[PDB]
Amino acid sequence: QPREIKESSYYNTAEYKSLISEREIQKTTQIIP
Amino acid sequence: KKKANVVSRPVILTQENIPAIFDNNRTFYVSLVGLEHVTYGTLINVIPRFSSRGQIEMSLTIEDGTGNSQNENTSVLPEVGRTKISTIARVPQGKSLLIGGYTHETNSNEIISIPFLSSIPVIGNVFKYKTSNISNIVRVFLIQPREIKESSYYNTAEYKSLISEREIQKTTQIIP
Amino acid sequence: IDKSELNNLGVNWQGTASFGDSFGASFNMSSSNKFIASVMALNQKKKANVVSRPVILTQENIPAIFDNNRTFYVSLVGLEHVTYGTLINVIPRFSSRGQIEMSLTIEDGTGNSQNENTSVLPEVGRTKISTIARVP
Amino acid sequence: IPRFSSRGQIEMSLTIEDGTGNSQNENTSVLPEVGRTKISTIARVPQGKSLLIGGYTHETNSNEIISIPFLSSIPVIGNVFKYKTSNISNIVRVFLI
Amino acid sequence: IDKSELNNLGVNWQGTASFGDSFGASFNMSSSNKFIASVMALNQ
Amino acid sequence: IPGVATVVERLLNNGKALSNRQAQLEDVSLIAYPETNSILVKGNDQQIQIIRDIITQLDVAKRHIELSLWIID
Amino acid sequence: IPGVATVVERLLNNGKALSNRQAQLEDVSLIAYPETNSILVKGNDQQIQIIRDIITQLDVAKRHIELSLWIID
């Protein structure tokens, strides 16, 4: 059974889970206080 | 005594004048009382098309059958031999044709006896030895084609999505 | 969809007999003290339903390829596996009244891997079909 | 190979292979063992949404019953002669972009 | 996502019997003193 | 199985005359663009008219045949 | 076994005359399009007339023969 893909066949995401946190990156590559 | 009936039916759909290929093979197992298998395979390649009065003409190459695999295991399993037929035939729509076939009948008797004493009236029948075999085999390849009309499709009108929208949102939404 | 029923019951006999040191007799024997009987009585039914569904998306008139294979394990009571693989390559496109026409090459099925292990695992054979069809 | 298209949609030509390699006491029960899957295709996505380019579901059901013919049919203790085996399994695998 | 359930329960029987030094009997055996039963009960 | 483009282009080949008709001038340029499953044509008005007519008469429906092969033992 | 297209095209070959008839001018273009199992023809009115007549006289029915081979011992 085939079907044409319409605008209702996509998934609403509207977000983007970053792999790693900004705080984590700052902690790991900031100059040591 | 032994009796066996086997009915196989491949079914393939295609567009007229375009070759179609269908091959398949399964393995049939039987578990011993306290594991014998036979590999049954078929391979049919066909070129169909139409002809006057809506008859269906077809060029057929058919191979089918099992592979030899010797306690009543062969008695239970199909073991229908192997048969290949290559030909071309046309069928009126609504009827079916017997393109190929093969029948076989065997009868055999054997008698062993001591020459003189086995001929005495009463107890002589204890010296003979009589063996007998009888067998009938019939194998038939018929075809029936049919044109596909609007009533030959299945009404579905729906589409089961593989995964749920809620599941996707749960698995790829930013954590609350 | 598969259904099967195998049942057997009855007795097999073999025998030997002697009289004096002169007369020997063997009843239902291939070649050379008394009778033995094997009694069999058993009935086993089996049923299996397997539903597989590959699903692939593409753009019209551009070929798409999808192949996959998993291994199904069953642990013995006190480890048998079957490798199920499919491979579908398709060329889809449109046609009058929005019908979808497709050229299909499909292969699918398992690989032969012989205590009820085969009775539990799918073991659906192998099947390849190559054709072309259009669907409303 | 990605690129853009009208209304800022993103079109991509994709070749994807993924999965494990077969390596047989509940070890396989704990480890992923997700098989192998390759999909080659091309698709375009509106920006802000995600698409299910590939997928594969599988369902298996199996029953087997072994029984002594006659006595296993007696009402009370007959149920001690049967032997019933059953398997059920569902598998879903999805490739979204 | 994978879910699976495998369960089996029941008994398998095998038997042997003798009468005098004359009559031998084997119950549910492939080929040649008394009955054995394997009981299975498990669900995973 | 040849394509419509190849067949038609080979048809309109090596003919020195005019005043054509259809039964149920120079070289045309007829190429196939399968990415959108289309044909690009270049020619005179009469040539394109006969091309349209012959193609329309050429591709119509491609009916479906389903074959059931009974094997009995 | 050659096809009707090949046979007829090879028939209409290397002949310098006109005023033809049928028994029970230049080069025609006759090609085979098996996708719809058809023939594309190009020629004069007399040539197409004789082609239609010869093809109609050529393909009719293709009757069926079934052979049973008895082997007795």
Numbering used by the authors:
A (entry chain A): 516 to 548
B (entry chain B): 362 to 395, 401 to 436, 443 to 548
C (entry chain A): 310 to 341, 350 to 395, 401 to 436, 443 to 464
D (entry chain O): 413 to 436, 443 to 515
E (entry chain O): 310 to 341, 350 to 361
F (entry chain B), G (entry chain C): 207 to 230, 261 to 309
From the paper:
The type III secretion system (T3SS) is a large, transmembrane protein machinery used by various pathogenic gram‐negative bacteria to transport virulence factors into the host cell during infection. The T3SS is a large, syringe‐shaped, membrane‐spanning, multimegadalton protein machinery. While the needle is a helical complex composed of a single protein (MxiH in Shigella [SctF in the unified nomenclature; Hueck, 1998]) (Demers et al., 2013), the basal body comprises multiple different proteins, either forming membrane‐associated periplasmic rings (MxiD[SctC], MxiG[SctD], MxiJ[SctJ] in Shigella) or the pseudohelical structure of the export apparatus core (SpaP[SctR], SpaQ[SctS], SpaR[SctT], and SpaS[SctU] in Shigella; Blocker et al., 2001; Lunelli et al., 2020). Here, we combined cryo‐electron microscopy, cross‐linking mass spectrometry, and integrative modeling to determine the structure of the T3SS needle complex from Shigella flexneri.
